[PDB]
PDB file of C-alpha atoms in Angstrom:
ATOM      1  CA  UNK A   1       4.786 173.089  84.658  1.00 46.80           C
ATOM      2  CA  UNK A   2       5.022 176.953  85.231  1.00 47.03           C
ATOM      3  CA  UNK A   3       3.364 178.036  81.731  1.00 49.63           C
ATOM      4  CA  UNK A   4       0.440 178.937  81.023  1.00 48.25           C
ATOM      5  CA  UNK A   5      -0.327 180.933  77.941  1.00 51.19           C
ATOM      6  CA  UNK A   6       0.936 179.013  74.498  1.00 53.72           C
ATOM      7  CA  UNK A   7      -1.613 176.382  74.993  1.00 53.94           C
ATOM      8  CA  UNK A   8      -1.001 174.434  71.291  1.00 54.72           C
ATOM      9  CA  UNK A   9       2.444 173.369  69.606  1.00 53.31           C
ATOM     10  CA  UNK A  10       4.369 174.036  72.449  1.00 50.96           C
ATOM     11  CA  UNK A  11       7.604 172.429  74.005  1.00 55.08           C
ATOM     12  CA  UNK A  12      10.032 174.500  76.258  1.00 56.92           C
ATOM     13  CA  UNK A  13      11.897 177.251  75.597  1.00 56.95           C
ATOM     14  CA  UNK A  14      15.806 177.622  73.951  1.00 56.11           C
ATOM     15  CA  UNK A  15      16.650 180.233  76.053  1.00 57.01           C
ATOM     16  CA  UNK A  16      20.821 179.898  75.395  1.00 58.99           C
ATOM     17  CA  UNK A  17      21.637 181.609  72.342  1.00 61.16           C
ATOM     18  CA  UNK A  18      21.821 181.529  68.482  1.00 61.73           C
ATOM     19  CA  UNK A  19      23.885 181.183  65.663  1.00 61.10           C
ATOM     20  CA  UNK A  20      22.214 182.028  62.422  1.00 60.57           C
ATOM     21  CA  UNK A  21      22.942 179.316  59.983  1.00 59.09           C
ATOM     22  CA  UNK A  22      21.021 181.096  56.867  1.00 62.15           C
ATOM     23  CA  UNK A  23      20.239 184.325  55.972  1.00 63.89           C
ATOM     24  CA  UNK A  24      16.733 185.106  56.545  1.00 66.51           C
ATOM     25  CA  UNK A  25      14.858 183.557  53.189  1.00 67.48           C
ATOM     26  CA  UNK A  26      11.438 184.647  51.781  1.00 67.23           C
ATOM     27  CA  UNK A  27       8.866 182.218  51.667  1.00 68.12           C
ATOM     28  CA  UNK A  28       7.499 183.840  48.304  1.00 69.29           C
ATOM     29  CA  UNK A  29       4.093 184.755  50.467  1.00 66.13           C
ATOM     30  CA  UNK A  30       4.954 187.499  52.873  1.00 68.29           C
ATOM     31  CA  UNK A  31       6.651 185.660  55.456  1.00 72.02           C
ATOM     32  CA  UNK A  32      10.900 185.112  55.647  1.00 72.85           C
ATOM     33  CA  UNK A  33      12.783 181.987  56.744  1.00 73.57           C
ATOM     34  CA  UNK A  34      15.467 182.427  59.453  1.00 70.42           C
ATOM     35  CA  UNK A  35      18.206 179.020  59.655  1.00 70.43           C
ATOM     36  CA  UNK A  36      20.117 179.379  62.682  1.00 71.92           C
ATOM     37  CA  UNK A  37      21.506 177.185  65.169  1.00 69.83           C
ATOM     38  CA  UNK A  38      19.969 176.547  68.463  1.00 69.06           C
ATOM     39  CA  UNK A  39      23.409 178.091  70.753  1.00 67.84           C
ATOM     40  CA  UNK A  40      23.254 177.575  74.619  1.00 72.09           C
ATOM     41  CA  UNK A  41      21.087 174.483  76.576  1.00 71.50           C
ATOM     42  CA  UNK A  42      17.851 173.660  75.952  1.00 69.79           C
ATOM     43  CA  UNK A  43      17.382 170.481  73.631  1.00 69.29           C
ATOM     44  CA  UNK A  44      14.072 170.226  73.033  1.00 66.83           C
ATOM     45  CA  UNK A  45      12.899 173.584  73.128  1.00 69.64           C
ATOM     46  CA  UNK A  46      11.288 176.669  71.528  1.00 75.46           C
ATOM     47  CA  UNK A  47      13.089 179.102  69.834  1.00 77.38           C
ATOM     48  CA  UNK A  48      13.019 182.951  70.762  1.00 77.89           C
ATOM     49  CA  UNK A  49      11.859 185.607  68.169  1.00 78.66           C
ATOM     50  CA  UNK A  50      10.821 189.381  68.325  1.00 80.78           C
ATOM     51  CA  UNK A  51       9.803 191.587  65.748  1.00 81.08           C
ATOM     52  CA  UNK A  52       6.529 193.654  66.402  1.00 78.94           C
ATOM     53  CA  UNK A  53       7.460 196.981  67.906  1.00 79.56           C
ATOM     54  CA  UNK A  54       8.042 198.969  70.746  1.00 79.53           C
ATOM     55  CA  UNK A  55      11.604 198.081  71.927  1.00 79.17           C
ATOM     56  CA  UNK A  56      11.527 195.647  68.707  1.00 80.61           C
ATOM     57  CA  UNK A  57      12.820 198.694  66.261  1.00 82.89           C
ATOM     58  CA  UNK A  58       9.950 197.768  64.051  1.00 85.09           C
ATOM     59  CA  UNK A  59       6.515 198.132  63.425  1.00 87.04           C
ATOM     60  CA  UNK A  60       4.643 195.164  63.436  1.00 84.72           C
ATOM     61  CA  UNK A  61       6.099 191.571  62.324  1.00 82.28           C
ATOM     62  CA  UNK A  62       4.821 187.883  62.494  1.00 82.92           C
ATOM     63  CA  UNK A  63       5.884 184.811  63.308  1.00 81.46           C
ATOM     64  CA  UNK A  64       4.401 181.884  60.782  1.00 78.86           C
ATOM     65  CA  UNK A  65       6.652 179.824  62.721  1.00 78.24           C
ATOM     66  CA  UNK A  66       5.849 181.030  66.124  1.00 78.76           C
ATOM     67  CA  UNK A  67       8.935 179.875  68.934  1.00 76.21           C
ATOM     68  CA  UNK A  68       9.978 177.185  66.374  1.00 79.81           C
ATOM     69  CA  UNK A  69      11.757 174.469  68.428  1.00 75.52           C
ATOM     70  CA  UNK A  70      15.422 173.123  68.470  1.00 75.87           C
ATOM     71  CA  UNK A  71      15.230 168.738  69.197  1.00 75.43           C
ATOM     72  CA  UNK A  72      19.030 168.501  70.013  1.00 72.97           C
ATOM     73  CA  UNK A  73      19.994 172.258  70.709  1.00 73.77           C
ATOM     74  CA  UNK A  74      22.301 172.236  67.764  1.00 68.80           C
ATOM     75  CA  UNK A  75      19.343 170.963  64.792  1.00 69.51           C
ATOM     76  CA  UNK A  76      19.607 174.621  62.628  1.00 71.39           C
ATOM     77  CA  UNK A  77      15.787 175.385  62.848  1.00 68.31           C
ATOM     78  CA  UNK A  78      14.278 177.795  60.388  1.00 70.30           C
ATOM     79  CA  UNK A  79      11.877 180.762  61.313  1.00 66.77           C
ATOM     80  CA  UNK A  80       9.358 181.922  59.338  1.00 69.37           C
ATOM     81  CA  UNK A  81       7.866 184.997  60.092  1.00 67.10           C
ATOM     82  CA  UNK A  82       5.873 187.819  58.200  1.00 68.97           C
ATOM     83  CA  UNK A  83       8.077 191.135  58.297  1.00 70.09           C
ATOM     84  CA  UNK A  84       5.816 194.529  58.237  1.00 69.78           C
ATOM     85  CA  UNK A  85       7.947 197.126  56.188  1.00 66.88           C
ATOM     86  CA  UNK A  86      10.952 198.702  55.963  1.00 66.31           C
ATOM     87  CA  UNK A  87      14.160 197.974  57.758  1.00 67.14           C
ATOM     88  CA  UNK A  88      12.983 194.686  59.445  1.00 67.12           C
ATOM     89  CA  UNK A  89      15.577 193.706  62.008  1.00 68.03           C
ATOM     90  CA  UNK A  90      14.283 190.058  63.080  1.00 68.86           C
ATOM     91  CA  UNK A  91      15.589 189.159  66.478  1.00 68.69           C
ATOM     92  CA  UNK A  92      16.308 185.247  67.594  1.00 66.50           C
ATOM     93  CA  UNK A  93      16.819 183.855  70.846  1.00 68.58           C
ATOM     94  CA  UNK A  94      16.949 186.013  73.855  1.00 68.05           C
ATOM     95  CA  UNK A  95      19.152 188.957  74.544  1.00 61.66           C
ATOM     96  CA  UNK A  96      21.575 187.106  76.115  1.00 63.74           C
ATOM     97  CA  UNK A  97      23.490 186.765  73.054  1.00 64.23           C
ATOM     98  CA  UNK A  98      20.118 186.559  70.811  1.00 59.74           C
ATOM     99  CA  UNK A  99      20.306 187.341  67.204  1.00 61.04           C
ATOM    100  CA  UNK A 100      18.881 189.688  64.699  1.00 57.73           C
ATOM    101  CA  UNK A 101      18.647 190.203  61.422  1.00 58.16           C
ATOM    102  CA  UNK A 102      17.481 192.961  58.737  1.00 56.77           C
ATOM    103  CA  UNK A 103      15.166 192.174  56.007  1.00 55.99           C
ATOM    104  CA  UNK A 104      12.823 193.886  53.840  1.00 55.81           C
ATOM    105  CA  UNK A 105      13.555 197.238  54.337  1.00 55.39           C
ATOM    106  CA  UNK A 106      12.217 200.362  52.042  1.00 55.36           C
ATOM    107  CA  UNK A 107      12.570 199.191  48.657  1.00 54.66           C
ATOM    108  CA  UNK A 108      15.386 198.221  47.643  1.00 56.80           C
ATOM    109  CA  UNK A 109      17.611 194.881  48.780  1.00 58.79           C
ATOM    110  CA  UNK A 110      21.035 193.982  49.742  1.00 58.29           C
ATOM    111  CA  UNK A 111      22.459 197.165  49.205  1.00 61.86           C
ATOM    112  CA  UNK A 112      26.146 195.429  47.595  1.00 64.45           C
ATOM    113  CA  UNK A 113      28.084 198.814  46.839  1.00 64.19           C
ATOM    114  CA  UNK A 114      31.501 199.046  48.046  1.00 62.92           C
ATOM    115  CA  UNK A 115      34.104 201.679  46.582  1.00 63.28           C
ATOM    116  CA  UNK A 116      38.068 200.348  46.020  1.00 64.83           C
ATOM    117  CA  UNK A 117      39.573 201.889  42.835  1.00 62.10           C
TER     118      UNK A 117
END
């Protein structure tokens, strides 16, 4: 009714929040898979995502998955999405409570080093 620019695969738009159900995943082909939960109201809707640049904290990301879409506002939808480089901070939903995530990064992954004893 008032859009007018994602002509194709296109629904609404979950602007409420998110919960991220699953880390992001790799698709083994560039891209990474984000499960999280539609959060907020918008049953059938798209889902939010940012990661290019600018006020993104990236460089340039993709979305394989472009606005994914909820179908009951609580159905955890996965986003796949082609991260550039580096620290790749993927954000869901809208800032409002959106999400984000890191992924990628330099070279190395899941930095698990902790001291104790």
């Amino acid at each position: 009714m008032d859009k007018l620019q994602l002509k194709g695969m296109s629904y609404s738009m979950c602007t409420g929040k998110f919960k991220v159900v699953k880390e992001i995943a790799e698709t083994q082909h560039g891209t990474i898979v984000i499960r999280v939960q539609y959060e907020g109201d918008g049953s059938p809707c798209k889902i939010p995502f940012e990661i290019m640049d600018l006020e993104k904290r990236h460089v340039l990301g993709r979305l394989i998955t472009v606005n994914p879409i909820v179908t009951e506002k609580d159905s955890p939808v996965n986003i796949e999405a082609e991260p550039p480089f580096g620290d790749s901070y993927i954000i869901i939903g809208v800032e409002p409570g959106q999400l984000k995530l890191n992924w990628f990064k330099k070279g190395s992954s899941l930095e698990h080093h902790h001291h104790h004893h």
